[PDB]
């Protein structure tokens, strides 16, 4: 089946999901590669017009443990998705609600099993997932952690604004197991998630 790991910004969800997918021996999936594909295709085609292009070409995300692939009209584009120009354009495309909906439609076509990570994987995309988790922590601890890697106050202020957006747009899935990660190492969180997957 499907494991969803959702959480707010600076929640360590991507690192936890990669470790959980590796432990289970299934692919890790996120939205990043699809946003990059949309940007690359918009650039290559020289493009509402973006969505007609994406839908028109036919895009598929292939979930593979060694590294996911993105095909457009049957062509593997994966290796072309990390250029500076894709980097510039992807920031902008990710912000379009219609592109977000398109990414969701493509994720929904990926057959299980996999560990999907994001904010709304267990609600907007895979509400039928058998194993849903929401990793939460106070904004202070997430800021404290991120600041170790700006000052605490700068990061905290940024996180508070991101949390406000997240809360106004979504809530954890009702059947998701919620874990406050405060006080736990990455290993502990990974272990906790796996201990809860029957």
PDB file of C-alpha atoms in Angstrom:
ATOM      1  CA  UNK A   1       0.000   0.000   0.000  1.00  0.00           C
ATOM      2  CA  UNK A   2       0.603   3.676   0.418  1.00  0.00           C
ATOM      3  CA  UNK A   3       2.333   5.473   3.347  1.00  0.00           C
ATOM      4  CA  UNK A   4       1.827   9.247   3.454  1.00  0.00           C
ATOM      5  CA  UNK A   5       4.108  11.459   5.549  1.00  0.00           C
ATOM      6  CA  UNK A   6       2.863  15.039   5.706  1.00  0.00           C
ATOM      7  CA  UNK A   7       3.974  17.882   7.895  1.00  0.00           C
ATOM      8  CA  UNK A   8       4.709  21.651   7.963  1.00  0.00           C
ATOM      9  CA  UNK A   9       7.853  23.439   6.770  1.00  0.00           C
ATOM     10  CA  UNK A  10      11.153  22.472   8.413  1.00  0.00           C
ATOM     11  CA  UNK A  11       9.561  19.298   9.781  1.00  0.00           C
ATOM     12  CA  UNK A  12      12.229  16.889   8.545  1.00  0.00           C
ATOM     13  CA  UNK A  13       9.482  15.027   6.623  1.00  0.00           C
ATOM     14  CA  UNK A  14      11.557  14.491   3.497  1.00  0.00           C
ATOM     15  CA  UNK A  15      14.425  12.890   5.467  1.00  0.00           C
ATOM     16  CA  UNK A  16      12.001  10.707   7.465  1.00  0.00           C
ATOM     17  CA  UNK A  17      10.150   9.631   4.283  1.00  0.00           C
ATOM     18  CA  UNK A  18      13.328   8.679   2.429  1.00  0.00           C
ATOM     19  CA  UNK A  19      14.457   6.564   5.393  1.00  0.00           C
ATOM     20  CA  UNK A  20      11.003   4.949   5.759  1.00  0.00           C
ATOM     21  CA  UNK A  21      10.841   4.117   2.022  1.00  0.00           C
ATOM     22  CA  UNK A  22      14.378   2.660   2.195  1.00  0.00           C
ATOM     23  CA  UNK A  23      13.446   0.529   5.202  1.00  0.00           C
ATOM     24  CA  UNK A  24      10.301  -0.750   3.546  1.00  0.00           C
ATOM     25  CA  UNK A  25      12.043  -1.287   0.236  1.00  0.00           C
ATOM     26  CA  UNK A  26       9.547   0.844  -1.752  1.00  0.00           C
ATOM     27  CA  UNK A  27       9.962   4.090  -3.714  1.00  0.00           C
ATOM     28  CA  UNK A  28       9.866   7.536  -2.129  1.00  0.00           C
ATOM     29  CA  UNK A  29       7.592   9.949  -4.024  1.00  0.00           C
ATOM     30  CA  UNK A  30       7.195  13.705  -3.774  1.00  0.00           C
ATOM     31  CA  UNK A  31       5.871  16.524  -5.986  1.00  0.00           C
ATOM     32  CA  UNK A  32       9.251  18.048  -6.837  1.00  0.00           C
ATOM     33  CA  UNK A  33      10.035  16.158  -9.988  1.00  0.00           C
ATOM     34  CA  UNK A  34       6.599  16.874 -11.462  1.00  0.00           C
ATOM     35  CA  UNK A  35       6.895  20.634 -10.768  1.00  0.00           C
ATOM     36  CA  UNK A  36      10.313  20.493 -12.484  1.00  0.00           C
ATOM     37  CA  UNK A  37       8.829  18.686 -15.448  1.00  0.00           C
ATOM     38  CA  UNK A  38       6.103  21.303 -15.829  1.00  0.00           C
ATOM     39  CA  UNK A  39       8.784  24.045 -15.784  1.00  0.00           C
ATOM     40  CA  UNK A  40      11.029  22.255 -18.300  1.00  0.00           C
ATOM     41  CA  UNK A  41       8.126  21.609 -20.661  1.00  0.00           C
ATOM     42  CA  UNK A  42       6.922  25.250 -20.396  1.00  0.00           C
ATOM     43  CA  UNK A  43      10.440  26.358 -21.339  1.00  0.00           C
ATOM     44  CA  UNK A  44      10.896  23.823 -24.191  1.00  0.00           C
ATOM     45  CA  UNK A  45       7.505  24.541 -25.754  1.00  0.00           C
ATOM     46  CA  UNK A  46       7.888  28.231 -25.217  1.00  0.00           C
ATOM     47  CA  UNK A  47       4.506  28.480 -23.544  1.00  0.00           C
ATOM     48  CA  UNK A  48      -4.122  28.109 -18.700  1.00  0.00           C
ATOM     49  CA  UNK A  49      -1.746  27.675 -21.620  1.00  0.00           C
ATOM     50  CA  UNK A  50       0.644  25.724 -19.402  1.00  0.00           C
ATOM     51  CA  UNK A  51      -2.094  23.277 -18.353  1.00  0.00           C
ATOM     52  CA  UNK A  52      -3.265  22.683 -21.975  1.00  0.00           C
ATOM     53  CA  UNK A  53       0.363  21.841 -22.797  1.00  0.00           C
ATOM     54  CA  UNK A  54       0.880  19.498 -19.801  1.00  0.00           C
ATOM     55  CA  UNK A  55      -2.420  17.721 -20.205  1.00  0.00           C
ATOM     56  CA  UNK A  56      -1.890  17.622 -23.917  1.00  0.00           C
ATOM     57  CA  UNK A  57       1.529  15.995 -23.771  1.00  0.00           C
ATOM     58  CA  UNK A  58       0.514  13.211 -21.345  1.00  0.00           C
ATOM     59  CA  UNK A  59       2.929  13.013 -18.354  1.00  0.00           C
ATOM     60  CA  UNK A  60       3.661  10.018 -16.134  1.00  0.00           C
ATOM     61  CA  UNK A  61       5.677   9.746 -12.953  1.00  0.00           C
ATOM     62  CA  UNK A  62       7.356   6.316 -12.637  1.00  0.00           C
ATOM     63  CA  UNK A  63       8.028   5.447  -8.957  1.00  0.00           C
ATOM     64  CA  UNK A  64      11.369   3.586  -8.723  1.00  0.00           C
ATOM     65  CA  UNK A  65      13.405   2.925  -5.551  1.00  0.00           C
ATOM     66  CA  UNK A  66      16.625   3.979  -7.256  1.00  0.00           C
ATOM     67  CA  UNK A  67      15.185   7.332  -8.403  1.00  0.00           C
ATOM     68  CA  UNK A  68      11.850   8.279  -9.939  1.00  0.00           C
ATOM     69  CA  UNK A  69      11.485   9.131 -13.591  1.00  0.00           C
ATOM     70  CA  UNK A  70       9.191  11.556 -15.385  1.00  0.00           C
ATOM     71  CA  UNK A  71       8.028  10.743 -18.942  1.00  0.00           C
ATOM     72  CA  UNK A  72       6.323  13.151 -21.316  1.00  0.00           C
ATOM     73  CA  UNK A  73       4.779  11.625 -24.461  1.00  0.00           C
ATOM     74  CA  UNK A  74       6.711   8.477 -23.644  1.00  0.00           C
ATOM     75  CA  UNK A  75      10.079  10.282 -23.412  1.00  0.00           C
ATOM     76  CA  UNK A  76      12.162  10.143 -20.221  1.00  0.00           C
ATOM     77  CA  UNK A  77      12.931  13.799 -19.195  1.00  0.00           C
ATOM     78  CA  UNK A  78      14.281  13.124 -15.762  1.00  0.00           C
ATOM     79  CA  UNK A  79      17.876  14.009 -16.455  1.00  0.00           C
ATOM     80  CA  UNK A  80      17.001  17.337 -17.945  1.00  0.00           C
ATOM     81  CA  UNK A  81      15.168  18.612 -14.874  1.00  0.00           C
ATOM     82  CA  UNK A  82      17.994  20.185 -12.870  1.00  0.00           C
ATOM     83  CA  UNK A  83      19.328  23.098 -14.871  1.00  0.00           C
ATOM     84  CA  UNK A  84      19.579  26.694 -13.622  1.00  0.00           C
ATOM     85  CA  UNK A  85      16.748  27.717 -15.965  1.00  0.00           C
ATOM     86  CA  UNK A  86      14.504  24.946 -14.607  1.00  0.00           C
ATOM     87  CA  UNK A  87      15.473  26.231 -11.107  1.00  0.00           C
ATOM     88  CA  UNK A  88      14.394  29.812 -11.953  1.00  0.00           C
ATOM     89  CA  UNK A  89      11.109  28.842 -13.625  1.00  0.00           C
ATOM     90  CA  UNK A  90      10.071  26.144 -11.100  1.00  0.00           C
ATOM     91  CA  UNK A  91       9.696  28.594  -8.220  1.00  0.00           C
ATOM     92  CA  UNK A  92       7.104  30.496 -10.289  1.00  0.00           C
ATOM     93  CA  UNK A  93       5.198  27.489 -11.657  1.00  0.00           C
ATOM     94  CA  UNK A  94       4.890  25.860  -8.226  1.00  0.00           C
ATOM     95  CA  UNK A  95       2.850  28.924  -7.144  1.00  0.00           C
ATOM     96  CA  UNK A  96       0.067  28.456  -9.754  1.00  0.00           C
ATOM     97  CA  UNK A  97      -2.994  26.655  -8.233  1.00  0.00           C
ATOM     98  CA  UNK A  98      -3.716  25.000 -11.591  1.00  0.00           C
ATOM     99  CA  UNK A  99      -0.235  23.503 -11.772  1.00  0.00           C
ATOM    100  CA  UNK A 100      -0.602  22.242  -8.196  1.00  0.00           C
ATOM    101  CA  UNK A 101      -3.838  20.515  -9.230  1.00  0.00           C
ATOM    102  CA  UNK A 102      -2.145  19.009 -12.245  1.00  0.00           C
ATOM    103  CA  UNK A 103       0.698  17.612 -10.062  1.00  0.00           C
ATOM    104  CA  UNK A 104      -2.001  16.030  -7.885  1.00  0.00           C
ATOM    105  CA  UNK A 105      -3.688  14.394 -10.840  1.00  0.00           C
ATOM    106  CA  UNK A 106      -0.405  12.875 -11.947  1.00  0.00           C
ATOM    107  CA  UNK A 107       0.479  11.571  -8.449  1.00  0.00           C
ATOM    108  CA  UNK A 108      -2.915   9.926  -8.199  1.00  0.00           C
ATOM    109  CA  UNK A 109      -2.004   7.761 -11.251  1.00  0.00           C
ATOM    110  CA  UNK A 110       1.021   6.185  -9.620  1.00  0.00           C
ATOM    111  CA  UNK A 111       0.281   2.572  -8.486  1.00  0.00           C
ATOM    112  CA  UNK A 112       1.264   1.636  -4.942  1.00  0.00           C
ATOM    113  CA  UNK A 113       3.410   0.781  -3.111  1.00  0.00           C
ATOM    114  CA  UNK A 114       5.350   3.898  -2.104  1.00  0.00           C
ATOM    115  CA  UNK A 115       5.995   6.477   0.659  1.00  0.00           C
ATOM    116  CA  UNK A 116       4.599   9.858  -0.423  1.00  0.00           C
ATOM    117  CA  UNK A 117       5.805  12.968   1.301  1.00  0.00           C
ATOM    118  CA  UNK A 118       4.432  16.533   1.355  1.00  0.00           C
ATOM    119  CA  UNK A 119       1.760  18.589   3.047  1.00  0.00           C
ATOM    120  CA  UNK A 120      -1.450  17.187   1.659  1.00  0.00           C
ATOM    121  CA  UNK A 121      -0.526  13.741   0.449  1.00  0.00           C
ATOM    122  CA  UNK A 122      -2.924  12.088   2.862  1.00  0.00           C
ATOM    123  CA  UNK A 123      -5.829  14.474   2.181  1.00  0.00           C
ATOM    124  CA  UNK A 124      -5.778  15.941  -1.360  1.00  0.00           C
ATOM    125  CA  UNK A 125      -3.957  13.175  -3.126  1.00  0.00           C
ATOM    126  CA  UNK A 126      -4.130   9.788  -1.440  1.00  0.00           C
ATOM    127  CA  UNK A 127      -7.061   9.956   1.003  1.00  0.00           C
ATOM    128  CA  UNK A 128      -7.449   6.183   0.684  1.00  0.00           C
ATOM    129  CA  UNK A 129      -3.864   5.510   1.890  1.00  0.00           C
ATOM    130  CA  UNK A 130      -3.633   2.772   4.498  1.00  0.00           C
ATOM    131  CA  UNK A 131      -0.850   4.389   6.509  1.00  0.00           C
ATOM    132  CA  UNK A 132      -0.990   8.089   7.028  1.00  0.00           C
ATOM    133  CA  UNK A 133       1.231  10.165   9.299  1.00  0.00           C
ATOM    134  CA  UNK A 134       1.524  13.851  10.147  1.00  0.00           C
ATOM    135  CA  UNK A 135       4.854  14.953  11.692  1.00  0.00           C
ATOM    136  CA  UNK A 136       4.407  18.081  13.745  1.00  0.00           C
ATOM    137  CA  UNK A 137       6.658  20.097  16.097  1.00  0.00           C
ATOM    138  CA  UNK A 138       6.324  23.510  17.674  1.00  0.00           C
ATOM    139  CA  UNK A 139       7.466  26.342  15.411  1.00  0.00           C
ATOM    140  CA  UNK A 140      10.070  27.169  18.046  1.00  0.00           C
ATOM    141  CA  UNK A 141      11.718  23.760  17.867  1.00  0.00           C
ATOM    142  CA  UNK A 142      11.600  23.643  14.078  1.00  0.00           C
ATOM    143  CA  UNK A 143      13.183  27.119  14.033  1.00  0.00           C
ATOM    144  CA  UNK A 144      15.751  26.107  16.662  1.00  0.00           C
ATOM    145  CA  UNK A 145      16.707  23.114  14.481  1.00  0.00           C
ATOM    146  CA  UNK A 146      16.812  25.009  11.214  1.00  0.00           C
ATOM    147  CA  UNK A 147      18.812  27.914  12.763  1.00  0.00           C
ATOM    148  CA  UNK A 148      21.573  25.467  13.808  1.00  0.00           C
ATOM    149  CA  UNK A 149      22.044  24.693  10.090  1.00  0.00           C
ATOM    150  CA  UNK A 150      19.901  32.924   9.864  1.00  0.00           C
ATOM    151  CA  UNK A 151      19.241  33.544  13.555  1.00  0.00           C
ATOM    152  CA  UNK A 152      16.514  31.774  15.524  1.00  0.00           C
ATOM    153  CA  UNK A 153      14.259  34.778  15.410  1.00  0.00           C
ATOM    154  CA  UNK A 154      14.547  35.152  11.598  1.00  0.00           C
ATOM    155  CA  UNK A 155      13.734  31.513  10.970  1.00  0.00           C
ATOM    156  CA  UNK A 156      10.953  31.517  13.599  1.00  0.00           C
ATOM    157  CA  UNK A 157       9.236  34.454  11.979  1.00  0.00           C
ATOM    158  CA  UNK A 158       9.426  32.776   8.577  1.00  0.00           C
ATOM    159  CA  UNK A 159       8.065  29.505   9.942  1.00  0.00           C
ATOM    160  CA  UNK A 160       5.188  31.197  11.738  1.00  0.00           C
ATOM    161  CA  UNK A 161       4.010  32.746   8.452  1.00  0.00           C
ATOM    162  CA  UNK A 162       4.320  29.388   6.658  1.00  0.00           C
ATOM    163  CA  UNK A 163       2.375  27.632   9.407  1.00  0.00           C
ATOM    164  CA  UNK A 164      -0.378  30.234   9.167  1.00  0.00           C
ATOM    165  CA  UNK A 165      -0.696  29.498   5.430  1.00  0.00           C
ATOM    166  CA  UNK A 166      -0.672  25.758   5.987  1.00  0.00           C
ATOM    167  CA  UNK A 167      -3.321  25.883   8.684  1.00  0.00           C
ATOM    168  CA  UNK A 168      -5.567  28.137   6.600  1.00  0.00           C
ATOM    169  CA  UNK A 169      -5.414  25.702   3.658  1.00  0.00           C
ATOM    170  CA  UNK A 170      -5.485  22.245   5.157  1.00  0.00           C
ATOM    171  CA  UNK A 171      -5.569  20.056   8.216  1.00  0.00           C
ATOM    172  CA  UNK A 172      -3.942  16.629   8.759  1.00  0.00           C
ATOM    173  CA  UNK A 173      -5.984  13.661   7.465  1.00  0.00           C
ATOM    174  CA  UNK A 174      -8.495  12.579  10.109  1.00  0.00           C
ATOM    175  CA  UNK A 175      -7.067   9.064  10.199  1.00  0.00           C
ATOM    176  CA  UNK A 176      -3.434  10.175  10.254  1.00  0.00           C
ATOM    177  CA  UNK A 177      -1.297   9.287  13.254  1.00  0.00           C
ATOM    178  CA  UNK A 178       0.149  12.606  14.479  1.00  0.00           C
ATOM    179  CA  UNK A 179       3.641  12.615  15.991  1.00  0.00           C
ATOM    180  CA  UNK A 180       5.145  15.592  17.820  1.00  0.00           C
ATOM    181  CA  UNK A 181       8.801  15.170  16.985  1.00  0.00           C
ATOM    182  CA  UNK A 182      10.071  17.569  19.678  1.00  0.00           C
ATOM    183  CA  UNK A 183      12.799  15.782  21.626  1.00  0.00           C
ATOM    184  CA  UNK A 184      13.367  13.042  19.039  1.00  0.00           C
ATOM    185  CA  UNK A 185      16.192  12.322  16.718  1.00  0.00           C
ATOM    186  CA  UNK A 186      15.631  11.439  13.020  1.00  0.00           C
ATOM    187  CA  UNK A 187      16.317   7.800  13.929  1.00  0.00           C
ATOM    188  CA  UNK A 188      13.654   7.880  16.660  1.00  0.00           C
ATOM    189  CA  UNK A 189      11.070   9.404  14.344  1.00  0.00           C
ATOM    190  CA  UNK A 190      11.842   6.879  11.592  1.00  0.00           C
ATOM    191  CA  UNK A 191      11.527   4.074  14.140  1.00  0.00           C
ATOM    192  CA  UNK A 192       8.247   5.422  15.409  1.00  0.00           C
ATOM    193  CA  UNK A 193       6.738   5.573  11.918  1.00  0.00           C
ATOM    194  CA  UNK A 194       7.845   2.016  11.120  1.00  0.00           C
ATOM    195  CA  UNK A 195       6.539   0.717  14.478  1.00  0.00           C
ATOM    196  CA  UNK A 196       3.117   1.969  13.436  1.00  0.00           C
ATOM    197  CA  UNK A 197       2.993   0.300  10.015  1.00  0.00           C
ATOM    198  CA  UNK A 198       1.230  -3.051  10.330  1.00  0.00           C
TER     199      UNK A 198
END
